[PDB]
Design brief:
It is found in: Mitochondrion. The chain is mainly α and 53 residues long. The chain is built from four helices and no strands. The longest helix has 12 residues. Bound molecules: potassium ion (K) (2 copies) and magnesium ion (5 copies). It binds one RNA strand of 81 nucleotides through helix 1.
RNA sequence: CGGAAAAAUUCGCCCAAAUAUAGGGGACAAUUUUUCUAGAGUUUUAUGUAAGAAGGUCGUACUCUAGAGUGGAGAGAUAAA
């Protein structure tokens, strides 16, 4: 019983009055932590070689 | 003691104890793996510069010697001697 009660609370939904009152944070900033490789990493590297030469 | 974004492992950490069997949660922590470039470095003779060291010099003054030099009784010192 002590385990179910504690596990239920840690995975409970936020309060409604907390949802309809808290300001908005764009998901582009609050969830985009992953940093992928530059898709143009190969094109840029080929242009940087020409400019450096 | 110390970056970024992920992953494996410990199950550290937390529920959480009774020195807790067995599990759950994944932010953080430890070992490790793969990527990243903001820290740290390398190249592109920088400029500027009384850091350092070696081998040689220059000059102003000083000093000694010589010219039986010129001159012929003072000089120097001190607040004064
Ligand atoms: K665990
Ligand atoms: K863990
Ligand atoms: Mg790499
Ligand atoms: Mg690069
Ligand atoms: Mg740098
Ligand atoms: Mg120079
Ligand atoms: Mg004479």
């Amino acid at each position: 019983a002590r385990y179910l009660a504690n596990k239920r609370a840690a995975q409970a939904p936020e309060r409604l009055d907390e949802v309809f009152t808290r300001a908005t944070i764009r998901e582009s900033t609050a969830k985009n932590t992953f940093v992928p490789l530059d898709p143009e990493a190969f094109v840029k590297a080929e242009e940087a070689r020409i400019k450096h030469a």
